[PDB]
Amino acid sequence: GRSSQKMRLDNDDLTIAISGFITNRIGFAIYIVLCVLTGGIAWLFLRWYPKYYVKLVGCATPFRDCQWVVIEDHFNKMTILSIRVKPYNRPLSTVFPVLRELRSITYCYYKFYYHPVLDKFFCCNGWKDPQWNSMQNARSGLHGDEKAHREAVFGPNSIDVDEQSILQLLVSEILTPFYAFQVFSLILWLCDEYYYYAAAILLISAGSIITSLLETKETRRRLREMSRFECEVRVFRGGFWRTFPSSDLVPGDVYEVSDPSLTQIPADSLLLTGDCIVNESMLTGESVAVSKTPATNETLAKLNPAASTFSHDVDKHFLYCGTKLIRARAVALVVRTGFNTTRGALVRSMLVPKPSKFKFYEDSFRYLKVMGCLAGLAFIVSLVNFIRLKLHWTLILLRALDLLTIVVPPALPATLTIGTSFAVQRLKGKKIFCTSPQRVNVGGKIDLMCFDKTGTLTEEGLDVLGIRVASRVSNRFTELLTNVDDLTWSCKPLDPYRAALYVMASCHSLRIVDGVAVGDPLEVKMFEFTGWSYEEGFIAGEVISAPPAVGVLRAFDFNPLLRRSSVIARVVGNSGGYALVKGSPECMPEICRPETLPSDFDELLSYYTHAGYRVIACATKRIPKLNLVSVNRMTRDEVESGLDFVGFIIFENKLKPTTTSVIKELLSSNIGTVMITGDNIRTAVSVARQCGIIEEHAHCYMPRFIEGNADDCNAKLRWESINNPALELDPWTLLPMPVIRNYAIAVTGDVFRWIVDHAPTDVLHRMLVLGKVYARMSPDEKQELVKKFQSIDYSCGFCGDGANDCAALKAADVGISLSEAEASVAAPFTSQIFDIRCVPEVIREGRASLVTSFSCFKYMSLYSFIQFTSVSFLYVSASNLGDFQFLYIDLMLILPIAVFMSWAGPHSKLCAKRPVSDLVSRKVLVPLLSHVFVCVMIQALAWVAVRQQPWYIPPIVDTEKSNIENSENTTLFFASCFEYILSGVVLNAGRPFRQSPLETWPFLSAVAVTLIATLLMLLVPPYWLFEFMQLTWMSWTFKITLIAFGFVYFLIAWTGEHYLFLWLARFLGRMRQRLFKQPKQRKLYKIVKEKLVFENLYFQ
Question: Which transformation does this protein catalyse, written as a reaction (predicted)?
């Protein structure tokens, strides 16, 4: 039958090609003997290259009734997982007669089920044997043992990750190709009487292994602790309910929502009876309390849980997974269980293998493979040269195989980590802890930097801007002063200022525990203002700098549904501040007395709602003083008559004081900034204007569905401005119709899904590049937008408060989370200080780390090539450097200079340039290759100079042991040492991205120490340093000549690195198109932006 099934996964990003290969063959025993007798074929090579393994142990089977199946994805990486066996599952609707021995796999927490009649694998779990039937069956629960029959087919609500043991992570990390080559090199060094440097590399590699092991373990702990939850639910069945843990029920079980201990909803469940009040802060990003009505039979019979999205009417009938309950206001039947739920499908995308778009740690190993390919040729040449001189076979093998180790240094990736580690230490010093170090270098190449106006660049709680008085004496509203003006104007029954100030702490339930109120944050902020808050008794503490006393009685609560609250209580005199009313300007101005209206009740409300502020109405009910008595009880509807408003109280999301400076710094540093939020567009645009994300006096355009239908694959968008409307945009080109002023386009969240689902790719890319404000965006839409940014070559980073939207933090290149160090989960970075000032710190230290990591890579490659040249110039006479000269070079000239060249802070000012991030492009390889060439030239000239001296001691070809005391060994030792120290000097970064070498001490001091030591060894070595290091007597004028060669090499290398090799790189770039004129593609966002600014805006 059919063998290979090529289907895309439900999420567009991931694709796979499931291929059902056979179990094994009789040849498995032949496989075992022939690949484990050597010990380095099966467990090493066929784990690194699975393609061949599966082409040996297996042939093919169309019939998917085998023991294990291999999985192929779009990134050419294959894993192997077996087939799980279950005895009995009779209904066909479970996968959708009788079915036996179901075949199933779980690949990256995707459950694939094989259906026998159709002979195919499916991942859709929408129907999943619903059997709801009618309401009376739904309330009956689920009798019998069928819960177990509905358990093994779908598992529990637990969404815990695959907790790999230490023995599995150990063989996953320690068994890399490199860490095998390092074991080979250490074995060679131990066999070649080279113990000290081998022990040093063993310690360094062990430290790297422990660091990576603890990093991965902490990452798994963070991922596991975030997604775990357990609670004792009360009901499974209608008959004999009893409290069981939430990791036990199956789809079809019914549980009481009104249980007192049920703080947050375990699994999504259709509401059978009663109403609920839920909080959706962490799914869909709305902290406003949401009502939930019980589901009806008609809505229950049309359930299609296959699609993650759904219509709006179904949303108000089933609960959400992992959402906090505001108050226990009810029983509900679960719809789905496990990773296939609303929160499950969003935690599954956080566990998929990342594409690893940062290719520096892959390009370094690719160039290491290239050096290994060169080292094979070097090994062959050394072998055939040593055959000519007829040396001992042990020494021939040792020298020829040691040349391979010299060319490919085992300490290159270990010294690629020291600069990153220093950057991590500096960041932890600056009170920002970063988990993944490898992302720090990615922070260098940040092109865009997203945000979130919930609590990141704005304060979390709502804040009061000012007040608006009724001004009954003069209908024109007075200017706001944000202070007390009670005695300034009379405006004498009551005063609007005193009445409003009494209202500010009247109609809300407030209480204290220690210093801070316990009430809802909407009402909490109001009392602090003017410093006349009364909580206990009646009177309060008034400031010294003649205000009437305070007092309140007959308190009530502000119902969000009816949006009204009235409190009557005498406070001063007999008819002053007696009735105080809180409400909303939506409907109560119609109820308000028309004489009180200053004819500004509507346009001011409209202007403040367009400005995104929150307006609440302050009113004074006109009731005579004759209604005061101790036993006073009046229903709300009796008091509610009248209620003319006497002012407006204004709320806003006041931005942090340093947000504007950070946004301006990022904009001036040629880094775009966007805002991704979940609240209404009216305040997101205002916050963007305040911060500087949208330029001042720049029009903001939103798309609307007016020109077409609503949704569902057929609509025509009209892009209209916020201020000064009827300035449309072309839906096909996104240009300002003149029927370069900054476009500042602000899409919404539902429209963004419309455009992603069905719109021209040019239109999507134009909006995506032009986008500045993204409001009403769920975290799923947040990560979709982040992936779209990565899809148009933006290397964007995310900067979000808390860890609710951690999917966007993990999907982005840099995931800075402004939360506590222990409260942060699934985020590469974590900042204790809650300002957004940490983004310049992260970007700046990332740029410094990127530059110093490229410098360390170039220095390590130069060290490898210099040693290869200085040993290949000596292998022509069966000689090499000494056992201690190699030690000195490898331990006191490359490791100290590397770890002290990687020790410098970043330049304080964020420059407008961007460091090079490609390890293959001509701006990196050409200076490195030219440095290799000039090092080879200087060493060759030193060798030629020493070969013509009268006191020359020629090397002697020896068989048993290679002689070291020859006059062309000392020259190639000292010239090599100078070419190491001065290359470390030259390749060190300077002003544009890191601290200047003059401004930092422990690099200049290290260079001075390692250069003075070598100079004293060259000029005046003691007697104990001759026989120890195997030097040879040299002329004093020749020592001066060696110093001159070192200085000339320093001059030429510095002039090349700064003034000449960049010109050579530009020359190769200019002559690139003479061979293949096709212009290498730039970033997609750069192309779209330049085309849009030039061609589409120069056709007026």
Answer: ATP + H2O = ADP + phosphate + H(+)
* Strand, coil or helix: 675: strand
* Among 73, 402, 452, 495, the one annotated catalytic: 452
Nearest to 869 by CA among 716, 1095, 1049: 1049
Cβ–Cβ contacts within 10 Å for residue 251, how many? 27
Phi, psi of 17, deg, nearest 5: -135, 85
Contact 856, 898 (CB under 8 A): yes
Phi, psi of 621 (to 5 degrees): -75, 135
Nearest to 976 by CA among 1016, 943, 1020, 1012: 943
The amino acid occupying position 651 is F
Strand spans (E) along 518-578: 564-568
Distance between CA atoms of residues 560 and 583, nearest Å:
10
The CA-based angle 420-425-430, given to 5 degrees, is 120
d(CA 1010, CA 655): 52
Spatial strand order in the sheet of 564-568: 463-469, 644-652, 614-620, 579-583, 564-568
What is the spatial distance between Cα 320 and Cα 756, in angstroms, rounded to a whole number? 25
φ, ψ of residue 58 to 5 degrees: the values are: -135, 155
Q: Which residues contact 343 (CB under 8 A, 6 or more apart)?
A: 159, 283, 320, 321, 322
DSSP 390: T
Q: Please, what is the angle between helix 681-691 and helix 659-668, to 10°?
A: 70
Contact 446, 846 (CB under 8 A): yes
* Beta strands in 118-256, from DSSP E residues, in sequence order: 120-122, 232-233, 244-245, 254-256
Show Cβ contacts of residue 187 under 8 Å, excluding neighbours closer than 6 positions.
none
Give per-residue burial for 104-139: e unless 16+ CB within 10 Å, then b: bbebbbbbbbbbbeeebbebebeebbeeeeeeeebe
Strand 745-747, strand 771-774: pairing: parallel
Q: Which residues of 36-56 are buried (b: 16+ CB within 10 A; e: fewer)?
A: eeeeeebebebeeeeeebbeb
Q: How far is 252 from 264, CA to CA, in rounded Å?
A: 20
What φ, ψ does residue 467 adopt, rounded to 5°?
Answer: -125, 155
Catalytic status, residue 145? no
Angstrom distance (rounded) from CA 725 to CA 727: 5
> Nearest 5°: CA angle at 486, between 481 and 492?
140
Q: DSSP assignment of 78-122, as one string?
A: EEEEE-EEEEE---TTTT----EEEEEEEETTEEEEEETTTTEEE
In angstroms, the CA 383 to CA 878 distance is 11
Structure tokens at 642: 């009248």
- Return d(Cα 554, Cα 1054) in angstroms, integer: 83
Cα–Cα nearest to 219, from 806, 786, 846, 783:
806
8 A C-beta contact, residue 647 and residue 582: no
Residue 478 is assigned to a ligand binding site: no
Strand partners, 906: 994
Output 180-185 pairs: Cβ under 8 A, ≥24 positions apart. Answer: 180/40, 180/44, 181/408, 181/410, 182/410, 185/405, 185/410
Listed residue (295, 282, 294, 296) closest to 325, CA to CA = 282
Distance CA 644, CA 617 (A): 10
Q: Per the annotation, does 259 bind a ligand?
A: no
Residues 332, 314: Cα–Cα separation, whole Å = 15
Q: Do the annotations mark residue 452 as ligand-binding? A: yes
Dihedral-angle region of residue 518 (phi above 0 means left; psi in -120 to 50 means alpha; beta otherwise): alpha
- Resolution rounded to one decimal, in angstroms: 3.5
Nearest residue to 126 via CA among 148, 95, 152, 98: 95
Q: How was this structure determined?
A: cryo-EM
Contacts of residue 53, Cβ cutoff 8 Å, sequence gap at least 6? 46, 47
